[PDB]
């Protein structure tokens, strides 16, 4: 299997961008294996 | 090459299954998105460096350079990078992950599964960390960690 990286562009912050989602404020737990999961 | 910039991952049609960033010299992704497979860049060859399954990191050719943090406080942006679309920035104010081991910065932003790697920006234009390891809550959308490294 080829897996392969091609350019996508320069890592620069947008002046004047879209303001966009919510903050939401989570309980959460993660495993050995690096899954996040909610406490309930 | 390595020249600094965001990368789509992809392997062979092509499918995009991520994205990452270079940075001095060294690529920085998600684990889940190369499984720390070697990546060709033009005519070259990237190897594994360093991972962690648990942080669901990987760099290639030298140890994780992203250091910068959230500073808890400010808004951030993503550098969404989808497949099949060109990269744009998502300006958003992080939430939180509480944890029994502090808390993490998390965007609430939903992408599709080749956008993982993906880099969250400070107002300086640092890397504070990457998008695609999350949560899924009651209402079916999408919380991204602020995945950072340890330099
Ligand atoms: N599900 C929603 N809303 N959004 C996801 C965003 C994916 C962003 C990139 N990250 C990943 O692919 C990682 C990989 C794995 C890393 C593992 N260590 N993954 C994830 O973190 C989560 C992990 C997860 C799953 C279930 C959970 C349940 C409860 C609590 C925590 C959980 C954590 N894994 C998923 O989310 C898998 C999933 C579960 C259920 C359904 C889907 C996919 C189908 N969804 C999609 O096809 C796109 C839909 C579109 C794309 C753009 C337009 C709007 C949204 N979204 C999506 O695929």
């Given at each position: ?8 562009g ?13 903050s939401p404020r989570?309980?959460?737990?993660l495993?050995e ?8 | 090459?390595?020249?600094?910039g965001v990368?789509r ?5 092509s ?11 060294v690529f920085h992704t998600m ?5 720390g ?19 669901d ?13 959230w500073?808890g406080?400010?808004?951030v942006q993503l ?6 679309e060109?990269?744009?920035?998502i ?12 808390d ?15 880099p969250?920006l400070?107002?300086?234009?640092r ?8 949560v899924?809550?009651?209402n079916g ?9 340890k330099?």
């Open positions: 299997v080829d897996m392969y990286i091609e350019r996508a320069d890592i620069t912050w947008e002046k004047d961008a879209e303001v966009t989602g919510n989570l309980d959460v737990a495993d294996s690096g899954d996040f999961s909610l406490v309930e | 090459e390595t020249t600094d990368y991952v992809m392997t062979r049609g499918t995009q299954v991520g994205v990452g960033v270079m940075q001095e010299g684990w889940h998105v190369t499984k497979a070697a990546l060709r860049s033009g005519e070259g060859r990237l190897d594994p460096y360093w991972g962690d399954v648990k942080q990191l990987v760099s290639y050719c030298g140890p994780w350079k992203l250091d910068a943090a500073d406080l400010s808004e550098l969404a990078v989808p497949p099949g060109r990269a744009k920035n300006q958003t104010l992080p939430g939180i992950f509480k944890t029994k081991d502090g993490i910065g998390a965007v609430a932003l939903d992408y599709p599964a080749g956008t993982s790697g993906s969250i400070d107002k300086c234009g890397v504070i960390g990457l998008y695609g390891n999350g899924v809550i009651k959308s999408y919380v991204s960690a602020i995945t950072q490294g330099r």
